[PDB]
Every structure is written in structure tokens, then in C-alpha cells.
């Protein structure tokens, strides 16, 4: 079932965005590649 | 146009992360697969 | 290294979700396609 995100971090070095779910104790985390770049 | 997210949920059972946009009334929602696992 | 998201926007017209990282000054931003639709 859907669970609100307590914390959401991202990494540009690997383009991998991690997430912290509140499912259970809070150890489970999601990860999905995401393009990154600088914006003017 | 870009719209701030009022609510952001995720599902590990299906690896599908849902989102709630503030565009219009607030019925529109995004969805994108995302790997999930336990972290020590 | 992981960095908390200060702002998170999304676009349904292009299905592209943008993000604002706190890495450095705060110019860097992530982007990843995401399906969108209406929910009843």
C-alpha cells in the first residue's frame, strides 16, 4: 500500500535518487536513475 | 508548467511510485517504476 | 553524496519531473520521465 516519504535524497555522481519509505520500521528505500545537469 | 508536489507516496509491492500534483483541482497524479529493497 | 530535496516540481505536458538539489549553490536539478493521468 502507498506510504508517505519521510525523507528523499538524490545523487548526481551516480544519477541515482534514493528515498526513505515509512513502511514498517523505515529501512526500506527506493532507487531510480535520473538525469542531472546545471541550469542557468 | 511545473507544479509543486503536495503529496508523494510509493509502493514497494509493485515498485510504482505515485505522486499528487497541484495542477487544477488536484486529481492528476504521476507514476514511475522504482526499484526497492532493504538497507542495513 | 546524497542531498535532501528543497523543492520538487513536475510537468504533465511533457511527463518530465524536475527536482532541485541542495548540492552546492542549488542550481543542479534532476529530471526523469513519468507517466501522468487523471484519477477518480
Amino acid at each position: 500500500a502507498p506510504v508517505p516519504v519521510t525523507k528523499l535524497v538524490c545523487d548526481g555522481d551516480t544519477y541515482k535518487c534514493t528515498a526513505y519509505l515509512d513502511y514498517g520500521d523505515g529501512k526500506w528505500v527506493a532507487q531510480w536513475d535520473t538525469a542531472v545537469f546545471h541550469t542557468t
Side-chain angles (χ1 to χ4, degrees), chain A:
Chain A
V3 297
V5 183
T6 60
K7 190 63 179 181
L8 200 300
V9 296
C10 181
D11 182 90
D13 300 90
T14 59
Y15 305 98
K16 298 182 178 61
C17 181
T18 304
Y20 299 86
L21 302 181
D22 185 86
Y23 180 88
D25 300 270
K27 299 300 180 60
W28 301 90
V29 297
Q31 297 184 330
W32 59 102
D33 300 270
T34 62
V36 184
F37 59 98
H38 183 267
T39 60
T40 60

